[PDB]
């Protein structure tokens, strides 16, 4: 009767403790979602084992083989009982697994060098002295390609033809580009990482407050699982108890390195 | 079993009477964000529906004396409605008795200031007293501060609970009026969605401070075991992913706003 939790290494959601080599079981891991799992299990009454998903992916269906990979696949195919991770609640995923209400709300956001006079996607869209881009693949790029909102379609039209390319191979390449470009590159990215990067040395980037869309991370369970319902009630309870915000403060801001 | 009874609530700009409503019948008497949302949900789920305004004008809570649900939640629980399509907050006590979709709008407690004022953050307010600040004298925003064990909010609560003259107001309109008339010495704490709305209202003298203090959601609600719950949830996700919910926010807040940029 031990519940198999699948999760994914993504700081500060799930991290290896520095001393993980000298620990066993669930004690090897720490982070926002490690704490969330313990609170969920307490409030629902279950024992559990943490596992890192074998392929390191969140979960998508291969168009050509119909096969889910990532944590979604592990749920669909019987390898784990629950996923506790910053796993985006999406239609195609909700067609095959069950999601709790979100424990975190987030969206696409703008990163600038600390000190840059920009304040919105609208600002970016109607000028050209500041370049801006996204990851060369994934949901943020797809959001701009797929979108029918003029401001963002304008940004996409600028991005898809910019020379030299305004796209980067990794989030880290993106952040570095903001840092070296003396205010002439802005990076578009998931908002929790923007905030996380804003709070650590070298303390030279800012998240622009307003987000460009609204998305959530939720706890995932296979369709018809007896757990989905209680787990969902737990997520709502923890939010209202302030626990979800406490953990965000714990893992993002309490050891912040930049004062503000 | 071939007309779906939608319960909702008169709350601007979610549901409103059209100017000429008396010359109209049925669902055409109404307009607004949730009226449009109801039309999209129905089209995507393939049902016909009738808008009805909740008899008691309430969202949903248990009576202190009888423990019986009032508001739209009650109309779902006790069989009077098939679906609630309204800015109904997703909460633990409500989700125990009815089902919610994933949120179609995300929001939180926010700060309102007079347009032109050196304040932003909850943290700033907690560190000073020149600028008084308060909430509605009842409801979820007040309960958030009273309940919070987070230091900055507990500081703000300890300030508000004893501040004299009272920083609490009897109505949303009284709070707004107090911001407008206090020359920057009064900030109001209220739901982010209404703050944004008030910002788009004449005489255009209030501003929403950007970052929120907590995170909630509004969802579509159905009675437990409804056949609709699953389809409605996927319809909500599709509408978010297609950009449709954001277009509706823009329509009823900024297009029909009185202050634009
Ligand atoms: O479920 C999903 N959850 C995700 C959660 C996050 C994070 F922010 F780390 F919490 C991220 N980060 C985006 C920025 O660089 C670091 C990784 C990607 C996610 N992806 C793939 P995407 O949606 O293509 O980005 C998913 O699929
Ligand atoms: O489900 C709920 N949805 C709510 C939606 C709204 C609005 F923003 F108008 F859409 C408001 N407004 C708060 C600001 O002044 C006007 C009314 C209250 C709501 N309440 C009561 P609360 O949570 O105690 O505030 C609920 O219970």
Numbering used by the authors:
A (entry chain H): 4 to 263
B (entry chain A): 3 to 263
Tell me, in the authors' exact words, what the paper reports:
To test this, we introduced cysteines at sites on the central axis of the D2–D2 dimer interface, cross-linking of which has previously been shown to inhibit channel opening by trapping the receptor in desensitized-like states. Thus we compared S729C, cross-linking of which permits the relaxed dimer conformation, with G724C which we predicted would not accommodate the relaxed dimer conformation when cross-linked. We also crystallized isolated cross-linked G724C LBDs in both the apo-like ZK200775-bound form (G724CZK) and desensitized-like glutamate-bound forms in two different space groups (G724Cglu Forms A and B). As we anticipated, G724CZK demonstrated reduced Pro632 separation (19.2 Å) compared to the antagonist-bound S729C forms, in keeping with the greater constraints on LBD separation imposed by G724C. By contrast, functional cross-linking of a different mutant GluA2(R) G724C/γ-2—which did not assume a relaxed LBD dimer when crystallized—trapped these receptors in a non-conducting state, indicating that this conformation must be distinct from that of native desensitized AMPARs.
AMPARs mediate fast excitatory signaling in the brain, and a change in their number or function underlies lasting forms of synaptic plasticity. AMPARs are homo- or heterotetrameric assemblies of the pore-forming subunits GluA1–4. The activation, deactivation, and desensitization of the receptor is controlled by ligand-binding domains (LBDs) which form a self-contained clamshell-like structure within each of the four subunits. Following glutamate binding, closure of the LBD clamshell around the agonist causes separation of the D2 domains, applying tension to linkers between the LBDs and the ion channel which opens the gate.
